[PDB]
Each structure stands twice: as C-alpha cells, then as structure tokens.
Design a protein around this ligand. Structure first.
Ligand SMILES: Cc1ncc(Cn2c(C)c(CCOP(=O)(O)OP(=O)(O)O)sc2=O)c(N)n1
Ligand SMILES: Cc1ncc(Cn2c(C)c(CCOP(=O)(O)OP(=O)(O)O)sc2=O)c(N)n1
Ligand SMILES: Cc1ncc(Cn2c(C)c(CCOP(=O)(O)OP(=O)(O)O)sc2=O)c(N)n1
Ligand SMILES: [Ca+2]
Ligand SMILES: [Ca+2]
Ligand SMILES: [Ca+2]
Ligand SMILES: [Ca+2]
Ligand SMILES: [Ca+2]
Ligand SMILES: [Ca+2]
Ligand code: NA
Lengths: 525, 525, 525
C-alpha cells in the first residue's frame, strides 16, 4: 500500500470523512485520487477554512480535519488557531511541505522550521522524518487532538511522501481506541460530594467544556438537586445551560472584584468546565471574599495550575458532571426562582436598538436555533434576550479574535443541518473572514447572517471609555455595503433599516432554501 | 516623560511617521493621544494591514511600522509575514498584550508565549520585562528590521506600560545611526574584479535585493562593461533590471536542470542579491555543468550558507554593486543584442488571452507604471510582455503566498503617489485579502486592480499536470462577482468581457481620480 | 509582605522544605535570609544538583525544588533534565535572571530567551512579567510539576523581584489542592474488567509509573487474580514488581520483533505505567503477532498517542491499578511458577565477572536495599541476580543519559535514610557527575558506590558489534584511579581486585557510618 492509501484508510477508520481545505501544489499529491467516500469543503482563505472546520468540530463534538498550503496557508490561519486553542477545539491541521530533496535549499513553498510555525497555539506539532512514518504521525495527530483537553494539532508532510510504500505494520494504527473519559477516584469523589451536600449556599459556575462534553443536562440535574444558582463563566465561548431555567443567573462580569462581589455569601462555589477565570477588564480587588471557597473541575492541567484561588480536579467534564449529578443529595432548600424577562426598550421607526434585534430574533427563530455572536458591543444584551433551551446553541470567539463567527456559522450549519443557524456579527467583524460567504453559497449551507451595522468598532469605543483614552484613530468603518459583498459571493441579501423591515427580512430569511445575509441598520453608540 | 511620549519621539527621530494598523483594546493605550505628525492607516483584517505596510516598505526602501491586536491579530497576519520574510521587508510589527497584572491568569486577550508566536518568520521577537525597557526594545526592533539582511521583527507590549514613566536615559536612543553599508575588503575585491575581467563568457543573475538596494542602475553599468547577458533569478519577488535593455534575458526557469542547461557555456556566473536558487518544480540534474563556476553576492548569511554550489560573499548589495560597476574593465566583446519582441497571439472577439491583456497594458500604461503580479498561471507571459524600464516596477509574493498583491498594491501606491500602480491578480488570489479594497477607497489611494477571471486556480491545474495528478478537488472558484465586491468596499468597478471593453475600461481607469477595479473575462485553461 | 517572604510561605504550605542548588549572584537575593525551616543541599556542578534532586523526588514520590544560576547553570543541568523528562520526575527548576533594568542590554549573566532554554525537556517554562506575579508563577510551577503526567518545569526570576512587595491576594495560592487522581468511568471500566476476566492467556507488562505511584502491591494482587505472567517494559527506569514473585518474568528485550515473539500466544496484554514501547536496538518485525491484542493504561497523553498498536486509557496509575486489582475475578488457572535461580558463573581468583558481583551483592545487602544502575553492559545480569522485594528498589537513567546514577543515589539515600542505597556504576559513567561524591561526604549521606572498572565503554563495544561497526575511536577509558577521586571529594575508598577483596570491602562498606566507594576490577569485554 502507498502512504496515501494507508493514510486515508486510517482517517476513515478513525471516523474522519471530510477535508476542510484551501489547496496548493505541495498538497496535490495528497488530494489526488481523492476517495469517493470523503468530501472536500473548499474555502477561499485559510482563516475561513479553519473557522468552518472549528464550527463543525465544536458542534459535532468530534475532530475536524484541515489541509492547508505550506507556511503561507498555515500562517493565514493562525488567528483562527488562537480561538481554537481557547475553545479546546479538536482540529487536525495538515499542511504540505516541499519535496524532501529540496527542503535544504529552501525552494519556493518550503515551510522552514515548520513545526515551530503554529506554536504556541497547538498541543502537538510535527514533521515526520520519513515517508513511511507519515501514517503513524497522523495517528498521533488524531489522538492528540481528541484526548482531553482537546485542541488543535499540526502535521507537515513533504509532498513526495504520499506515493511511497507504507510500512506494512501501519495497519495496527487503524482501529486504536484511546480514552480520556476519567473521573476522580471514589474516596475523593465521596469527599467532594459530602462538601457539596453540606454547603449552606452553594453556587455553580459553568464554562464551555460543559457544552463540548454535552454535560448540560447533567449540570441541570446537579443544580436542581443542590438548589443552586448557575452562572456562565466570563468571556463565554459556548452556552452550557438552558437560559430560562429557574436556576440560571446569566453571564458573569469579566472582572476580579465584580466576580468576588457576585459570589459573596456563597460558601462553596463549584466551577465546571471553565478557566478560573477568563477576566477581561482590569477590576482589581479580592479574588474571593471571606467566607467563599472555590472548587474547580477542569479537563485542562494548564487551567488548574493557573487558577489564582480554589482547589481543582483535572478530569473529563462529561464523566464528572454525570457522577456528581447522580451522587449528590436533593437539598431541602427551595429551588431558585427564575430571573424576570428583560424589559422592552423604547424603539422608534428609525435605526434598530440591538435590544430590539435580539427580542425579534427570540420571537421569530425556531426553539432549536443555534446562535453565533461576533457583535462585540452587544453581548450582554444577547445573553439576556435569547432563550437558548438546548445544548450547542451559542458560539463566541474563545480568544476574542475577530473572524471566527462568519465561517464557524457555516461549519456549525453543516454539522447540524436540521437546526437553523443565525450568526449575529458586527459590521466590523464581518470583514475579517468575509470570503467564507462563498462556501455557504457554493455548498448551499443555509446559514443566516445578521450584520449589525452601526458604522464603528463599538466595543473599542467602550473600552476606550473605560481607559478614559481620547484621540484614538482607526475606530470607524464607514462605507461598507454588505448586500453588495453578499451578492459578490453568491448569497441572497436583504436590508433592514427599521423594525418593519427587520421582521419582513427575517421572515423571508427563515423561509429561504439557501444562505441569506441581512444588513441591519443599528443605532450608533 | 511617559513611555508613550518617549516611544513616539524615538519613532519620529528614526524617520517613522505612519502606523499601519487594525486596533484592539490592548492597543488603545498606545494609540490614544495619537501624535498630530503621524498618520494611521486602518485596514479591516491583519493580512491586509501587513500587506499594505509591506508594499509601502518595499517601494519606499525604508522600515514600515505596524500595530496589531494580541495573538489573534498577529496570527491573522502570519501568512503575510511569510512573504515579508522572503522579500527581506523591513517591517516593525508591534502587538498589544494584556496588562502585566493579568498575564499570569491568562485573561481574555492575553498573548501567551507571545515572542514564540511569529517565529520562525521574524529576525527578532521580544516582549520587554518592564515598562521602562519599552523604548529600548523599540530601538532594538527598529535597528533589527533595518540592518542587512532586512526583515520583519516583532515586539509585544503590555498595555499598562505606556502610561508609566520612561527611563530618563532613553534619550540616547533617539539619534542612533546604525550602518550595514559594507563591501568586501580591497584585496579580495581586487581578486573578484580580476576574475570578472578574465572571464571569456560571463553571465549575471540578479535577485530582489538588487531592486531593494536601488542597485539597478549600477547593475546595468556592470552588465554593459562586462558585455554580459542578465537574467532574473527564479520565483522573482521584484524586477532588478530594465526588461528591454539589450543584455536582458528574462526570468530564469525555476528548476535545477533547466538552470544549469541555461548557464552551460558560461564560465563565470555572478549572482547578485538572490538566493541560489529559489527553485520551485523538482527538475533534478546538475546544479552547474562542467565549465561553469558561480559567485554569489548576498546580503543574507542564510542564503550564502545554503547555496548548494559556488563561492559567496556576504555584504550590502548597494555597496557591492556600486564597487563592481566602477572597478571592472570594459570588455572588448560585443554587447549582447536585445531579445525580440514577443509575438501577438491570435485574439477573437471573446474572452481575453492573458497575452492580449499584458500587451494592452504595455500599450496603454505610463512608462513609469508599477505592476504587481498575483495571476499565478500567467507570470511568464507577464515578464515577456511588460516593458519595465525603471526600478521598483514589479512585485510578486516572495514566499508564493496568496494575499500579498492586492494590499501591497495599495501600500506601493501610497509610497509612490506619482507612479500609477496596476495590480494584476487572479480571481482566486483576489479573495485572500479582498477587504484591503476598503482602505484604497477610504484614503483615496488610486491603485488600479485588474482581476483576471478564468474561474479556476489555473496554476494548480498546471502543477497537477506536472505531477500527472488526477481527481483533485477544490480547484474551481466559480460564482464570484468582483464588481459587486468592489462596490461593497466603495471602489469603482468596470467589466471587460472582450478586447474592446478591455481598452475602454483601461482608458476610464487611467483617467480616474480614485481606485478602480476591472474584472477581465480571461480564457479558461 | 515581600515577594521573598510570600514565595517561601507558598513553598512550605505546598510541602517543600529543601532547596537543591548551586548558587550564583542572580540567586543571592532569593537565598538570603534563608528560612530556618528549610535546608539547602549544595552540589558542585548542576548536573549533580539536578541528579540529586531527581533521586530525591523519585524516591519520596513528591516534587523536589532546585535553584540554578541563569543560563550557564541551567544549561549544565540539561542532560539531567533529559532523564527527568523520561522518568516523569516532578522537578521545580528555578534559575535567577538579571535585574529587570539590565535584561535588555544583555548584561553579563542575562539568561536570554530564558523560557526557551530548557525546551523541549520541560512541561512548562516561564519568566514572569512583573515581580508581584512571581508567587503565582511559582504556584503554577508547583502544580504543573506535580499533576499527572509529572515532569520537570522551569521558572526564571529577575533578581530584583524578591525584595518587591507581594500582591496581598497571593495568600489564596498557599493552600490550593490540585488533584489528578482519576480513573476510567464505571461503564468503560466494567468493559475493561470483563475483557481481562474473559482472557484465556493474559500477560501484564509494567513500567516505571507503577513504582512512581506505589502501585506495586496492587499490581501483585492483579497478577495473582489473573494468574498472569508479569514483565517489566524495556529500558526500565524503575522496578515495578517483586523480582522473585512467581509471576515475575523479567525485563523485556528492547526490540520490536523480540517483544512480539515474547507475547505470542497471549491473547490480551495489559500494559500499565509504561510507554509502548521504549525499544532501543532496531529489530524490525511485527509489533504484535496475530492473536494478541494490547491495552495500555498510561498517565501521559503523549505515550497514548504514539503507541503504534493497541488501545489506551489515559488515567492515574495508582487509581487504575487499585480499581483493577479490586474488581477483576480470581481466575481458576494455575498461578505461574517462579523462574529458576540464575546459575553461578565460573569465577577464578582474578578479575570479577559482573555476575559474581551481583550475586555477592544479593548475598550481603539488606533485603530493603535500593539499587541504582549505570553499568550499561551488565543490566540484564543485574535484573536476573538481585532480589528486589520492595517498591522503590531500582533506578536507571530513563533517557539512557550517563551522569544520573551517582548523584541520584545520594538523593535517594537522603529520601530513604533507613534503606541502604547501593549504586552500581561503570568506570565510564562514573566520570560524568563525579563531583556529586562531595555532597555525600559533606552531608554524610551514606550511599555506597560500587564502581565496575573494566577500562572501556563496554556497551558501546556491544552496540558496535550489533551494527558490525569497526575502527571506532574513543571507546576506551584507561588510567582512572577511582579511590583517588573518592579521596579528592572526602569519601572513604576501597578496592576489590578479586572475590575475597570484594567480600571484605562490602562488609566494611555495609558497616560504615558514611559514604563509601568500592572500585571493583571487572573482566574486560
Ligand atoms: C483579529 C482581531 N483584530 C482586532 C480585534 C479587536 N477588536 C475589534 C476590532 C472589535 C470591534 C468589532 O466591531 P463590530 O462592528 O464587529 O462590533 P461592535 O460595533 O458591536 O463592537 S472588538 C475587539 O476586540 C480583535 N479582537 N481581533
Ligand atoms: C496562502 C496560499 N494559499 C494557497 C496557495 C496555493 N496556490 C493557489 C490557490 C494558486 C491559484 C491562484 O489562482 P488565481 O486565480 O489567482 O490565478 P491563476 O488562475 O492564474 O493560477 S497558485 C498557488 O500556489 C498559496 N500559494 N498561498
Ligand atoms: C550523556 C551521555 N553520553 C554518552 C552516552 C553514551 N553511552 C556510553 C558512553 C556508555 C558506556 C558507559 O560505560 P560504563 O563504563 O559506565 O559501563 P559499561 O562498560 O558496562 O558499558 S553506554 C551509552 O549509551 C550516553 N548514553 N549519555
Ligand atoms: Ca461519494
Ligand atoms: Ca460595529
Ligand atoms: Ca497632522
Ligand atoms: Ca484563476
Ligand atoms: Ca532549622
Ligand atoms: Ca566500563
Ligand atoms: Na510560531
């Protein structure tokens, strides 16, 4: 067998059937004779390739496979890799290298010092020392991306390797099963459960690894048994809990003092599946107030090591959430009462307030919609106004890096063809990965893109206010026609300058059979 | 003085007055109170920011200063950095880091292991250990980017550093002058000159560092004195010689055997300002034929070390080209005769052959036009058909990475406001950095963009033919309307479906007062 | 509080009370005012500092703390770090940096690019961005070294940081408890247990992480219930099983084909606490024969990813070994019968055969002796001839790197003051870390060092035979007087040129109250 045949066999035997890619000439010997059981999803720039694969992996809860061109293609994808690192996304990033005979001379298209290029944003990065090693290196990449804590990996392969003979012993790679589905030992788990049962006023804080593990329903059972309020850890990349459940308390503020004030009076705070904590603004004060202790369950040793307070347990989130939910006692405390509905903001017949947009989306979208957020100044309102009952219903760029939501919404829609995806993206953020629209058109992936057009980088005006920073250049983005950009890439486009037109465009988009972009005129900050 | 005030003083005293950027919140404390003597050039994605700065640096022959946001902004720019590394572009890339007090907890927007992120594509990469060190670290960045061999550098700065007090001794940085303008010692230079004077059939091969050094006119004098044919080294990022001078022989084929066959019969081959060599296709055979010896003058030790044949001298290209041109004897051999004009290819009233497009551009463009090339299947025809008499007249992505020419054409036009820039870009390549069009519109930078629309990644069909690779996915890019994309970003747009409309659109574009995009329907390969 | 006071408080609250070090001037501000409850163990070169700390950590099963001088001190220790990486040793390596104000100028003693220096041999490597961050960075180092898979970490600290004020919130670091004591979830564990109960001819292979976890006794119970033969995985750094238990089958040969032939006929092979596998010689063939399947339990994702065959479970070895030993059924198969005693080799009245030395050590040493091995050509005989009943009884350089056993034997003896340590070290290996002898003398740590003096690098003659390599320089080491080297560093020294003198020197050494070196004249290969 050739290295090409053996490597595609390993991929299919490990459950991989889709290649997300933008091709080049070091990759043609891999892509030739492409197997009939695989698909190839082309995107026009590599941030878009990786964003699409990232949405697909996060929504499918399985690894996604990427093929990029050498150093320039890998490099175009590195902002997308920053977000994938912070969302623990299992991405297998492959890139083609020059033929071994010209690597030393640094022929055009040589990826020099290849394994160092995507560091520090990958768990494992490698170029094999011979062609026969390629299937074993691919096996390492698959398992490194997929074991907890999941994350992106990188493999560079000289183009001449594919046609070489494979090692006949590579068949032992095909059916390897590797598990990291582990939980705390019984004695120490019993100690944790007794601490939770004994707490007088527990709180629960949930992060994105809960949604990645599909541990959401176990966390609902846990919060119901403990009768405990539930927040989402700050800077949230995913939604880990039903947002209209009575225990839900919303997104935590991303500040040290704000969080310790929020948690004041809670004797035990159990954090599951989150870093402790993804603060943003600098809000110095106490990490926790006197009387509060914190316990974190995390799948990632790096998160356990860096927490500035609390105890930690490094284990699988699905296995731990299931065990805790089934072992804790039902408290005789009263269940928390649901938060009140948000108020309706006053809306005239002109430009839309973001609050009006989210209320109208909540009124009209299906109950199993999936939302993505890259409208950076409106996140708090989005979390207050969208009822997200089901797992896998929310994604936000985990490293804060623009350029994620537009392509990731296409990958999520490909992973979840029966759930309508609605990406809410600012006019600033929409540009970073605008060419991803083409992939939605070409493959007829029916994502809805709602562009919140207020003419400016609104969140940077907000943060400038926090810093009291004046005379800052580069904050306005006037003069972009998003219906013409959508037409450029083959996507149907609608405009909404007022609430009547917002309702009409959403009705048309929800009834459409392909992707649709709606440009919404929103109020200037 | 504050670190902010001291750092902007150092920049202006070192000749920097423009910041190319896409802002974020770790950068607002640097950008606030932006000095009145500086400009800020916004672009909507970081590949575009860096591409624009790269064109500006290459055309101005001076360092360009960039400010990006943390890891995601730096990462979005890394394919642009791959090209800048291979063009020796002096780029000072700065990125903002979180406040020092939250780096350890990895707050949102922390650039983890920052200095390792852009490696291996930078000459120097650093984050200072204290605020007071920031001006000295910036001084190091300026000089590292600017000394031979020039190239990109990276500096990460915690946002809280800017408002701190500067070291009063930082004033000694402001006027430092650092020179690498060096040439081979007199005794060894005299040995080289005697070898050139004694050659019976010398050849000259020139690379991009000749054009970077503005050594073009000295190389013309050298070739006239030696009566020697002149080629351009393969995979050329720049044009180092007048293309209709009698000595000019064109772009070398990018293959080992093809180059040694071309050079057969030449006893001494002098390479100036090029790697030896940027081969592309694998074309194994002899590096040089018996009877040919090679001497390379390069500004880059890495190029001298990796050449597989020949002697080398590591020195400044401007200083060496001037010395050689003024020291060699005038040979009594006959001057080489000019190559014949290219033939006119047959053209019907339908889609345009690329040969027709380049002939029409050569007929209509000013004699001091500047061309950029990212039309990958038509490079050989472009080099045969455009008379480029002057330095700084051609740029092509030096690492072969798509996404360079569209933004770089805007930076070159900003650097050379009296020379019309004409970027010839394939329909595939145009997508990688499409949002750069917005910067041309907003600042009214009057670049002309000629999009060669043949519906496919034509060069990858070519390379697939070379490999005899069949059943390759992802090679076609149908369904893109480039006039709608140009309208989306505010640029005037024209279409040319035949030769009459090509001539009319070029006349309109050359008479326009702002940027113009022309979509040309070209023949399918 | 100062950073100095807060950092020593964090260390003591996390169970650290000993600093292994060789001092320098960047470290004096850390070491000044050394707390009365800490000890400092000086060694004269940094390979020896780290080797001693490594033996101490491995034997105590807890992290050991090291302080080295800048880049040169760290660099002198990097061969010791290679062994610590492959033994999963929890080492917290700290090094002093220049004062922040002169790092940029690269004053003498600046550790440039410090965090990159010990990579790739550490799990985590860092220099803090401010003085106040130092206690949190130390907390990260402690937990990163101690969480599974354990391993060395590195922290560089500018010397001016120690006297600065600490962050008042650093107290939340002092009592953090972090656990990685996890095992496979109940459903999948029940599947594994049923596979073991159903096997017709199971085998068990154990590696060093069994001894690190003190899982040895649980593995004896497991092998007794399964009635299964037990081997030790190749290139063994530790001894994980009693070597005269009836199930014990010895050290596996370090070859691919040799291992699959050994395992032929075993239907399920359970590997616990080992890489799969640390082969050495290249012995190509099948990884496993038809009819054998392999299951690996490992604490290290990198080991699970790279195994070329089998299933894997990534979990804590102590927790998994305990669960399996208590859940499997007692098989009705007959218990394996003990291997026969090794034969006595013929010994004349001259130089000693290694077999005679190990038989005499086994006859005379206490039953709770601890052995170290750096006598590279005699490993197989050592494993056959020493009855090691107890955990923690054997150490061998895990990366194969010379210079481990001499210093590590001193650290093991410090960790286990009531168990006699006997280091068996070749005359070649003894030189690499010879100055460690001084620390044993100065602190009166009563290690016994048995130097096997055959005048040559015996194992390299063996491997040269395997390669059929002739005319190799550098294999002989004549002319070393080890009793004079021991006298040089203050250690009592004895010579044994025959068996009578070997017995007399061992009796004298076992009765001594301080360290003793015995130089044994062994037969030339
Ligand atoms: C890759 C990248 N570049 C720049 C930024 C900085 N950035 C920018 C540019 C923001 C403004 C996004 O504007 P928008 O129009 O999408 O939304 P708002 O107007 O609601 O803020 S928010 C933010 O952090 C970033 N985070 N990531
Ligand atoms: C960043 C990046 N991604 C992909 C490629 C691979 N690539 C691609 C995609 C080419 C086709 C460009 O198509 P075009 O339409 O611009 O021009 P032609 O049709 O004349 O080839 S040429 C080439 O090397 C690349 N070099 N750089
Ligand atoms: C740091 C280092 N340097 C060199 C070696 C190579 N080496 C050497 C030099 C060996 C010979 C050790 O000789 P010895 O006298 O200690 O024992 P034998 O004579 O029994 O082999 S075995 C071996 O792998 C090594 N592994 N580690
Ligand atoms: Ca099919
Ligand atoms: Ca906006
Ligand atoms: Ca001005
Ligand atoms: Ca094309
Ligand atoms: Ca004391
Ligand atoms: Ca020896
Ligand atoms: Na990198």
């Amino acid at each position: 067998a050739s290295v090409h045949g053996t490597t595609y066999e390993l991929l299919r035997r490990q459950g991989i059937d889709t290649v997300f890619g933008n091709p080049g000439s070091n990759e043609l010997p891999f892509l030739k004779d492409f197997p009939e059981d695989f698909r190839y999803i082309l995107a026009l720039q590599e941030a878009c390739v990786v964003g699409i694969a990232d949405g697909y992996a996060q929504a499918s809860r399985k690894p996604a496979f990427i093929n990029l061109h050498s150093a320039a293609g890998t490099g175009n994808a590195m902002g997308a890799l920053s977000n994938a690192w912070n969302s623990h996304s299992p991405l297998i990033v492959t890139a083609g290298q020059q033929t071994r005979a010209m690597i030393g001379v640094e022929a055009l298209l040589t990826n020099v010092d290849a394994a160092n290029l995507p560091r520090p944003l990958v768990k494992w990065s490698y170029e094999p020392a011979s062609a026969a090693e390629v299937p074993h290196a691919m096996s390492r990449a698959i398992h490194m991306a997929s074991m907890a804590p999941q994350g992106p990996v990188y493999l560079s392969v000289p183009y001449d390797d594919w046609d070489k003979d494979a090692d006949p012993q590579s068949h032992h790679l095909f059916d390897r099963h590797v598990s990291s589905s582990v939980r705390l030992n019984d004695q120490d788990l019993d100690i944790l459960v007794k601490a939770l049962n004994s707490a007088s006023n527990p709180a629960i804080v949930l992060g994105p690894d809960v949604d990645a593990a599909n541990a959401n329903a176990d966390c609902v059972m846990l919060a119901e048994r403990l009768k405990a309020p539930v927040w989402v850890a700050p800077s949230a990349p995913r939604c880990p809990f039903p947002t209209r459940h009575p225990c839900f308390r919303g997104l935590m503020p991303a500040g040290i003092a704000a969080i310790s004030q929020l948690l004041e009076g809670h004797d035990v705070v159990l954090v599951i599946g989150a870093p402790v904590f993804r603060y943003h603004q600098y809000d110095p004060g106490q990490y926790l107030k006197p009387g509060t202790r914190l316990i974190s369950v995390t799948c990632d040793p790096l998160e356990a090591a860096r927490a500035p307070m609390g105890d930690a347990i490094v284990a699988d989130i699905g296995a731990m959430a299931s065990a805790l939910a089934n072992l804790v006692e039902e408290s005789s405390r009263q269940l928390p009462t649901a938060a009140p509905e948000p108020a309706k903001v006053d809306q005239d017949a002109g430009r839309l307030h973001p609050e009006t947009v989210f209320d109208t989306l909540n009124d009209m979208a299906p109950e199993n919609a999936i939302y993505l957020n890259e409208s950076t100044s409106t996140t708090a309102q989005m979390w207050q106004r969208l009822n997200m009952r089901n797992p896998g219903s929310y994604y936000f760029c985990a490293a804060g890096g623009m350029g994620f939501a537009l392509p990731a919404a296409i990958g999520v829609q490909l992973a979840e063809p029966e759930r309508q995806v609605i990406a809410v993206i600012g006019d600033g953020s929409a540009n970073y990965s605008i060419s991803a629209l083409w992939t939605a058109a070409q493959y007829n992936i029916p994502t809805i893109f709602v562009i919140m057009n207020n003419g400016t980088y609104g969140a940077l005006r907000w943060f400038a206010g926090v810093l009291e920073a004046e005379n800052v250049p580069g904050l306005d983005v006037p003069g972009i026609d998003f219906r013409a950009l959508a037409k450029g890439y083959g996507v149907q486009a609608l405009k909404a300058d007022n609430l009547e037109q917002l309702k009409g465009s959403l009705q048309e988009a929800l009834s459409a059979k392909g992707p649709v972009l709606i440009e919404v005129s929103t109020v200037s900050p």
